[PDB]
């Protein structure tokens, strides 16, 4: 159930009006949501891909990123939020009674194009992350609708973010990584080693199922909850970084203020666009119309999807396995610049 | 070891020259090394001095403008001033050898003397010199002088005084024989092919092929053809290094792959500098002959050889289509990220991108782009630097700039390259060299990998402090002055790439730039030149395939094969592309451009103007024809309904007979208007983008040429075509005439050209400065008058950009090069906010901001950057304007009441005609939107009233005709 | 899959400016192209039908027919081609640029001496050919890449009202009750077929699918690939004829009516076949579905529109590159369109 590898040929293909920038998987029902460079937002059920379910033009510009979340409470619906180049982040509501999109509201506060959003639930309260081209990470509240904290983690505009509890990692256009603790809003460590802008960075969440990089080393790393980070850039390389232990509002150690590249996965023919972690395998795509599958233990590519798209492969994702609220089903969908999307079944 | 420049292959001549050079130097005598460029004087000197722990080499490269101060500045970091005054070397055990390259280049004054030559003869004969500020005599103790030069018969060289060469021992270094060169480069090819052992038996034939190719290139392409056709063994070693790099960073090779790779390297080394297509074909045939003679494989053209590491992890030959698609997507991303420019990616664009990438991927690899303006030199350089991760540094050299600003920019770039390890691409335009001191600074920067004049005294000491701190940061263990500055030089050489943009290579400044010694022998000369007709066909097709063009019957005309430059004619699109290419060629032929490169800016501007104008015309024609058709259908339906089965409706139907006749005539002539739409749009776009700087006779002759050329390719046009009747509307005409335009048709055409230019900043040549007050009347109080000759102009322009005022800049012959991004329409978009960079800080474009440039001086100085990117309009008085002004003056001074009545009558008649036209348009709009009968009756009555007013007012024309006939002789004598 | 039954009630209601002339469905996306009697062509989304995506005043007169297809080039970027015919004696070729969702008018086709009545477009391995028919008693065959006609001849004495293209054979329906199948490359007739008493409305070929009418009879019929055809006229009867095999440039001999249909209360306008069921509308504002095996009406959709039904669009199930989506759009003269999704 964990060592599943997708087949060499997709079973169903999704056709979209323009370039597909982001795709997301519904944790519960077999339906995939598809973004569009033209500005539309689609949703296709996994079994009848001939026609969509709902599609509206909410953003006046190209969607840059989106994500999904199934809320839970101790006292319960899918929340989808979409960023774009239209200087506004739109929050929607997915009602399964009618399977129709319902807009909740729109968010403002950025001075340039926003490129990444992350949503997480903490104690019956959810927050939406956001990084934009104005060099600020303005993460916002879904309930109140106002801002919470604004900070500048890089000298150049931030291209991707990821949230693991109270910690956020940021990858920017200045070929550096910076880890900042959000509630205090202070930088903790700086990660250098790339020479081309970062495309996507995310945490390596701990798993309990023996993957080398998904397990804590010592007791302190297990207590902190995180040890390793994975990042991709325009270097045609994927690098595995490690978080040095801070002095613990954590205090950045002067002698432990730098990262360390534990591994450097290479073999792509162009810029690595998006990455995903499933068990011991790392799934990545690039502009070479190819998708790799990097084993974490061996640090070597296992399966290559030659010419999956006729153009660039913008995005892909898997099901999250580090969270018990979402069952890690064997679904993977890849978005392409050739106005097409491929979904692999079982 | 091919990369290392310190390797020397020991031959008989090499060891002989090296040991006699050492014997001469150990005898404490002056040495001058002479010979043709590329002989190996520097090579034999360095080989002799590497094996010695007794001497150090200080390299100074002389140019046309070298002073004693440059020689002393280059000696600052190597020599110490002691009072025992005496100028010892800093080292106590090693002597210092002052090596002076290109020593003939320091020019003479008006009395035939060289400052540097006399300084050096003072240094050798008297062993010292006089220190200028304190007037004291220093003594040279342990410094030797070695000179390198070319024979005085070489161009740019001057004879030296006999007092100089009396103290110097002269050795002549000649070109090695073909056998010796073959042996040298067969050793090099063995070293290269050690990486590919399966082809180790082909090292010798490759060496003979390369040497024969070099000899044939030297024989065929001589200085008498072009001044930059100087070949040397340096070309052969460049080709060898490129071959080694290409196999080193490439996949497993075959014999065909090796031969094609060697041919590609030969193309990039020997044939990049070729100007004419005849020499390109000669080199292609020469490569064919060399391969058949020495290596007994597909096509060996420049476009057929496309080796690139962009599409894969290794340097290899790639397909054209996938490379074009990859470059298209990458340039889309580049337009998104840095600057939005609507460019078309063509085959020669791809080849130039590949060779610029090849140059920028090297170490100590520079570029010298020579070609016409608006060819895609600096934008391609920035795109390639973005692809390679380099930082683009364009110096902000403007008017009122001196040596201090350029030295500051160069020092900042050098510090970023070395201390901050920022890999930098430095783009130096030919217009950024204000005087020859800038060129000397760049010569010093290129010849070495440092500028010793920029680091003197306390600046030198603080540079040492900064570099010591940075070296401690990296952890390298070095503390001596020599090793630290060698690390400085190595970092500068590794991280700095200089690209030169040259538009007119026949200018004296550009000729000195090309013929500069270090610029010639370090840069990779890439003669891009003007666009060949294939490139123009490709880009024209790629910008006219997205516009509705083919909507009428088209028969392919019978034309010669040599006169068709596109694919064989099948649609109107190919005929239009060929027509535009032919008119561009005829235009540049009739303006006696000669050997000056022909800029394609006119072609691209004409293409864009044609596309937008035909789109607008097609939309308007379709809408108008649909309106006429639905109006006729509604009238017919109403008539039929009335006939089948209310007096106001009957009267309205009866009164619409003339309107129905007009609609029927328009419907009948719709086919004729559709026949000649494309030709009219083409002629219009030629008017805006070509005829701005032409008088009426040149415009008429060129229109005749365009008309016969457009009829040649079976494209229809309006026989009675007129620019005013096609682009100038009545409302615009009245606005211009009440603003202050003259009644002259040439001025109306110029005003239509300047007003309908919404994509290029116009340029005005009005000696009378009438256009200034005309445009100030056009925009009223929101206009602003700036000038390039006034202080604080930059702040006023930035404030007007923020507010959105219409800006007119006088003194157009004094162009200020920091508004270049405004001139080139280089804007940065931040959502709904559009910003431009002026000076040193970004400023927000309001969107209502407009730019006009005015110049009242005919035959002034307009830089090629400004000249090629403006809609330059000439406002020069002609015979008709002089006659009109003479008649107006004589009628005002003879009978003022009659003149006032006549001009009031003309204004009333034209206003009534516009009212009638707008009333007909309103009648058509109201009829399309279907009380209403009463409104239509009122409109018809108003139209009848206007017609009666015109009929009554048209009874005073004979008096004006008689007055014109009376004063015509006065007007003709006045003109 | 291909045996889906359309819903009893319509799912979407889209309003147009005038009477609907021709309706085509985008084979890849929920996009419907509709042309009005004023010549304006619209692009409506199936999820947002309140406002069009793009509108262009293509023709100055009433639209007669429209056909769309997606190009499949082995080398060249893929795009969709819209061919629209009207009473302006000219046919324009369009292109759906979904990146910005607009219309680009690629080229037009001029030369017809009357009002073009029908169009039919097909794609070869690397070539696209344009078929058309007008009231000038001629069927002009054009080329999409070049733009000029490659074949022009008179197939019937009267005016051709419909035409179908399948390979090198074209079946033309005229105002006369007779039809004629002619070779396109040779420009010569092969067979003729009569039996009707009213002018023909729409004649379309039948493609075999790997069914009584979609299965080859012998090896020679499979080698030829064409055995049965469908025809419709104003006689309120749709008859399926049999195409005889000529002596193979083919050298030309009568069409035998192997089946017939009855029950239409008015003149039929469009005929659509999806798998084993054939759907056709008429001026009685009713849509009847007839199975090819039993040859009788199964389901009826009456009172769809106040006016007469103009045309209906169905995805082709005989094309590998075209997905057989379960959707059907029908247009009417009441300035409205009905969509049955799933
Ligand atoms: N052993 C050798 N004998 C002769 N020439 C050589 C030898 N090795 C290299 N060369 C060639 O001599 C050239 C050196 O020329 P260079 O010294 O730069 O010219 P200049 O003497 O004008 O400075 C190199 O480009 C190389 O190709
Ligand atoms: N391949 C191309 N297609 C279309 N336009 C081009 C192309 N190359 C250059 N241009 C025109 O040239 C301008 C930029 O060229 P640039 O590199 O600045 O030329 P230069 O270096 O001679 O000043 C642009 O405004 C563009 O319109």
């Amino acid at each position: 159930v964990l060592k599943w590898i997708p087949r060499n040929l997709p079973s169903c293909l999704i056709n979209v009006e323009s370039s597909v920038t982001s795709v997301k998987l519904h944790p519960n029902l077999p339906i995939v949501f598809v973004a569009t460079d033209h500005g539309k937002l689609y949703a296709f059920d996994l079994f009848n891909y001939t026609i969509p379910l709902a599609s509206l033009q909410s953003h006046t510009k190209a969607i840059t990123s989106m994500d999904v979340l199934f809320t839970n409470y101790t006292n319960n619906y899918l929340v989808i939020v979409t960023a774009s180049k239209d200087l506004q982040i739109h929050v929607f509501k997915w009602v399964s009674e009618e399977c129709k999109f319902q807009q909740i509201r729109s968010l403002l506060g950025h001075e340039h194009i926003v490129s990444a959003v992350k949503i997480w639930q903490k104690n019956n309260d959810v927050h939406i992350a956001s990084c934009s081209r104005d060099q600020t990470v303005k993460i916002w509240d879904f309930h109140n609708g106002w801002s919470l904290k604004t900070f500048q983690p890089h000298s150049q505009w931030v291209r991707s973010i990821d949230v693991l509890g109270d910690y956020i990692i940021s990858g920017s256009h200045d070929t550096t990584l910076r880890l900042t603790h959000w509630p205090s809003g202070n930088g903790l460590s700086v990660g250098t080693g790339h020479e081309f802008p970062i495309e996507k960075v995310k945490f390596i969440h701990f798993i309990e199922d023996e993957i080398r990089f998904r397990t804590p080393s010592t007791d302190r790393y297990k207590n902190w909850g995180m040890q390793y980070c994975v990042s991709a850039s325009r270097d045609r390389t994927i690098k595995i970084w490690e978080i040095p232990l801070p002095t613990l509002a954590p205090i950045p150690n002067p002698t432990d203020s730098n990262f360390r590249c534990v591994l450097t996965l290479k073999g792509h023919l162009s810029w690595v666009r998006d990455i995903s972690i499933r068990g011991q395998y790392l799934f990545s795509c690039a502009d070479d119309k190819s998708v790799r599958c990097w084993d974490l233990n061996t640090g070597q590519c296992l399966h290559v999807w030659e010419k999956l798209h006729t153009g660039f492969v913008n995005c892909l994702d898997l099901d999250v396995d580090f969270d018990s609220n979402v069952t890690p089903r064997q679904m993977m969908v890849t978005g392409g610049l050739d106005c097409k999307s491929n979904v692999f079944m079982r | 070891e091919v990369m290392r420049p310190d390797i020397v292959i020991p031959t008989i001549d090499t060891i002989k020259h090296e040991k006699i050079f050492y014997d001469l130097l150990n005898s404490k005598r002056g040495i001058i090394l002479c010979g043709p460029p590329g002989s190996g004087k520097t090579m034999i000197m360095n080989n002799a001095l590497r094996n010695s722990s007794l001497y150090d080499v200080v390299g100074i490269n002389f140019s046309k403008d070298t002073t004693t101060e440059h020689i002393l500045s280059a000696l600052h970091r190597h020599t110490n001033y002691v009072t025992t005054l005496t100028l010892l070397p800093k080292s106590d055990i090693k002597n210092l050898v002052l090596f002076c390259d290109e020593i003939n280049l320091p020019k003479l004054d008006k009395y035939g003397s060289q400052n540097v030559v006399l300084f050096l003869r003072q240094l050798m004969e008297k062993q010292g010199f006089w220190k200028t500020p304190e007037n004291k005599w220093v003594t040279i103790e342990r410094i030797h002088i070695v000179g390198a030069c070319n024979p005085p018969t070489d161009p740019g060289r001057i004879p030296m005084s006999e007092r100089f060469t009396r103290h110097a021992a002269i050795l002549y270094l000649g070109y090695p024989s073909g056998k010796s060169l073959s042996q040298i480069y067969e050793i090099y090819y063995k070293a290269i092919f050690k990486l590919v052992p399966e082809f180790r038996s082909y090292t010798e034939p490759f060496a003979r092929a390369s040497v024969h190719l070099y000899n044939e290139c030297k024989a065929r392409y001589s200085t008498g053809l072009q001044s930059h056709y100087l070949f040397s063994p340096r070309e052969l070693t460049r080709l060898v290094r490129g071959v080694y790099t290409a196999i080193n960073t490439g996949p497993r090779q075959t014999l065909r792959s090796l031969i094609r790779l060697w041919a590609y390297e030969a193309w990039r080394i020997f044939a990049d500098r070729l100007v004419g297509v005849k020499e390109k074909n000669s080199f292609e045939q020469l490569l064919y002959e060399t391969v058949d003679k020495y290596l007994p494989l597909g096509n060996i053209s420049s476009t057929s050889l496309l080796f690139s590491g962009l599409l894969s992890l290794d340097f290899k030959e790639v397909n054209k289509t996938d490379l074009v698609n990859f470059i298209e997507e990458r340039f889309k991303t580049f337009c998104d990220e840095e600057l939005e420019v609507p460019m078309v990616i063509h085959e020669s664009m791809v080849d130039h991108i590949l060779r610029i990438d090849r140059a920028l991927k090297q170490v100590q690899g520079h570029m010298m782009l020579i070609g016409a303006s608006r060819t895609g030199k600096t934008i391609l350089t920035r795109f390639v630097a973005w692809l390679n991760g380099l930082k683009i540094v364009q110096p902000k050299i403007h008017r009122h700039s001196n040596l201090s600003d350029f030295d500051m920019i160069l020092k900042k770039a050098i510090s970023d390259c070395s201390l901050k390890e920022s890999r930098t691409c430095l783009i130096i335009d030919e217009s950024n060299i204000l005087e020859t001191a800038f060129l000397e600074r760049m010569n010093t920067l290129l010849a070495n990998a440092d500028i010793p004049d920029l680091f003197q005294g306390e600046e030198y000491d603080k540079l040492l402090n900064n570099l010591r701190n940075k070296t401690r940061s990296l952890g390298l263990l070095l503390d001596t002055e020599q090793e630290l500055y060698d690390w400085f030089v190595g970092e500068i050489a590794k991280n700095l790439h200089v690209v030169f943009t040259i538009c007119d290579p026949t200018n004296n400044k550009s000729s000195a730039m090309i013929s500069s010694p270090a610029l010639f022998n370090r840069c990779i000369i890439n003669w891009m030149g003007d666009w060949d007709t294939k490139t123009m066909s490709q880009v024209a097709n790629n910008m006219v395939d997205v516009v509705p063009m083919e909507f009428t019957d088209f028969i392919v005309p019978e034309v010669n094969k040599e006169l068709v430059f596109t694919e064989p004619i099948q649609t109107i699109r190919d005929a239009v592309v060929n027509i535009l290419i032919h008119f561009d060629r005829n235009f540049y032929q009739k303006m006696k451009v000669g050997v000056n490169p022909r800029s394609p800016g006119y072609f691209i501007d004409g293409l864009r103007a044609l596309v937008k104008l035909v789109t607008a015309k097609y939309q308007d024609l379709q809408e108008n024809q649909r309106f006429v058709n639905v109006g006729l259908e509604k009238l017919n339906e109403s008539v039929l309904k009335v006939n089948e089965l209310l007096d106001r409706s009957i009267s309205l139907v009866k009164s619409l007979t003339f309107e129905k006749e007009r609609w029927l005539n328009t419907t009948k002539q719709f086919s004729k208007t559709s026949q000649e739409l494309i030709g009219n749009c083409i002629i219009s776009s030629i008017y805006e983008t070509y005829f701005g700087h032409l008088n009426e006779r040149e415009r008429g002759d060129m229109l005749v040429i365009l008309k016969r050329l457009l009829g040649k390719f079976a494209v229809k046009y309006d026989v009675n075509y007129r620019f005013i009747d096609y682009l100038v509307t009545l409302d615009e005409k009245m606005k211009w005439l009440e603003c202050g335009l003259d009644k002259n048709d040439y001025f109306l055409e110029n005003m239509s050209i300047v007003m309908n230019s919404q994509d290029a900043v116009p340029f005005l040549l009005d000696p009378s400065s009438h256009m200034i007050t005309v445009i100030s009347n056009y925009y009223g109080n929101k206009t602003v008058l700036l000038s390039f000759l006034e202080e604080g102009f930059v702040k006023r322009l930035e404030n007007a950009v923020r507010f959105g005022s219409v800006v007119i800049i006088q003194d157009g012959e004094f162009f200020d090069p920091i508004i270049s991004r405004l001139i080139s329409r280089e804007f940065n978009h931040a959502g709904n906010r559009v910003t431009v960079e002026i000076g040193d800080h970004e400023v927000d474009v309001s969107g209502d901001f407009k730019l006009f440039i005015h110049s009242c001086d005919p035959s002034g100085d307009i830089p090629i950057f400004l000249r090629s990117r403006v809609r330059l309009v000439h406002f020069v008085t002609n015979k008709e304007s002089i006659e009109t002004r003479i008649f107006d003056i004589t009628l005002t001074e003879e009978n003022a009441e009659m003149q006032r009545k006549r001009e009031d009558l003309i204004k009333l008649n034209t206003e009534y005609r516009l009212k009638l036209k707008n009333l007909e348009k309103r009648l058509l709009e109201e009829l399309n939107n279907s009380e209403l009968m009463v409104t239509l009756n009122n409109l018809k009555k108003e139209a009848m009233n206007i017609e009666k007013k015109l009929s009554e007012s048209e009874e005073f024309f004979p008096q004006f005709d008689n007055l014109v006939e009376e004063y015509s002789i006065i007007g003709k004598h006045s003109v």
Side-chain angles (χ1 to χ4, degrees), chain B residues 43 54 128 209 289 298 328 373 502 716 752 843 873 973:
Chain B
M43 176 193 69
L54 308 180
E289 291 151 7
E328 281 178 354
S373 58
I502 303 184
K716 264 79 179 174
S752 178
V843 65
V873 193
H973 275 296

Side-chain angles (χ1 to χ4, degrees), chain B residues 681-683 685-727 729-737:
Chain B
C681 296
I682 287 179
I683 298 183
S685 66
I686 298 299
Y687 288 167
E688 290 89 7
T689 77
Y690 270 95
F691 286 18
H693 45 92
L694 265 60
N695 46 44
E696 57 263 14
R697 295 294 87 193
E698 282 162 332
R699 282 187 183 176
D701 276 333
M702 280 288 255
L703 169 65
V704 162
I705 281 182
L706 177 59
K707 272 176 186 261
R708 60 89 174 173
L709 193 152
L710 189 141
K712 172 199 258 169
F713 282 88
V715 179
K716 264 79 179 174
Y717 68 102
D718 198 356
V719 183
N720 314 318
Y721 183 83
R722 279 204 58 243
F723 182 48
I724 301 299
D725 306 345
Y726 211 81
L727 276 296
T729 74
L730 276 297
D731 301 292
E732 293 164 321
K733 192 184 160 180
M734 292 181 183
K735 191 63 170 103
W736 302 336
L737 290 175

Side-chain angles (χ1 to χ4, degrees), chain B residues 676-683 685-727 729-758 760-780 782-790 792-802 804-833:
Chain B
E676 308 163 333
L677 182 59
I678 302 293
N680 291 353
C681 296
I682 287 179
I683 298 183
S685 66
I686 298 299
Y687 288 167
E688 290 89 7
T689 77
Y690 270 95
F691 286 18
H693 45 92
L694 265 60
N695 46 44
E696 57 263 14
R697 295 294 87 193
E698 282 162 332
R699 282 187 183 176
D701 276 333
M702 280 288 255
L703 169 65
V704 162
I705 281 182
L706 177 59
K707 272 176 186 261
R708 60 89 174 173
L709 193 152
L710 189 141
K712 172 199 258 169
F713 282 88
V715 179
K716 264 79 179 174
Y717 68 102
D718 198 356
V719 183
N720 314 318
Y721 183 83
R722 279 204 58 243
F723 182 48
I724 301 299
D725 306 345
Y726 211 81
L727 276 296
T729 74
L730 276 297
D731 301 292
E732 293 164 321
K733 192 184 160 180
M734 292 181 183
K735 191 63 170 103
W736 302 336
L737 290 175
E738 66 183 1
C739 279
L741 271 295
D742 291 331
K743 208 72 168 156
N744 188 231
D745 285 326
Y746 176 68
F747 269 67
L748 270 186
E749 288 174 10
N750 293 292
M751 189 67 203
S752 178
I753 287 176
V754 65
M755 287 316 291
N756 203 42
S757 168
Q758 67 264 16
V761 166
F763 203 106
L764 315 170
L765 269 298
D766 217 355
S768 52
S769 283
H770 184 44
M771 278 305 134
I772 297 169
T773 187
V774 159
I775 300 178
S776 303
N777 290 343
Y778 201 96
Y779 299 106
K782 71 177 73 67
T783 196
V784 61
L785 299 182
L786 312 184
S787 167
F788 292 127
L789 283 183
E790 74 178 7
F793 150 75
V794 182
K795 277 74 69 177
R796 301 258 302 282
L797 185 58
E798 289 181 28
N799 289 331
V801 163
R802 293 177 207 278
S805 173
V806 170
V807 179
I808 309 164
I809 311 178
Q810 287 100 22
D811 295 330
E813 59 269 5
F814 299 107
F815 164 68
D816 200 72
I818 52 160
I819 69 154
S820 66
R821 293 182 184 271
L822 273 184
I823 291 310
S824 52
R825 310 300 302 276
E826 194 272 329
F827 295 147
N828 189 359
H829 311 285
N832 55 317
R833 185 180 67 189

Side-chain angles (χ1 to χ4, degrees), chain B residues 8-11 14 37-43 176 184-185 188 233-234 237:
Chain B
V8 176
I9 292 169
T11 61
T14 289
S39 310
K41 311 174 280 281
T42 303
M43 176 193 69
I184 288 153
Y185 298 123
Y188 276 165
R234 270 185 285 207
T237 190

Side-chain angles (χ1 to χ4, degrees), chain B residues 7-11 13-14 35-44 99 101-102 148-150 173 176 180-181 184-185 188 232-238 241 521:
Chain B
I7 62 170
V8 176
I9 292 169
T11 61
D13 295 5
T14 289
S39 310
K41 311 174 280 281
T42 303
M43 176 193 69
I44 62 161
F99 186 38
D101 286 328
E102 296 294 328
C149 63
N150 297 163
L173 265 292
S180 180
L181 281 183
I184 288 153
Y185 298 123
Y188 276 165
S232 303
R234 270 185 285 207
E235 326 284 333
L236 289 173
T237 190
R238 281 217 273 140
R241 291 197 167 126
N521 297 115

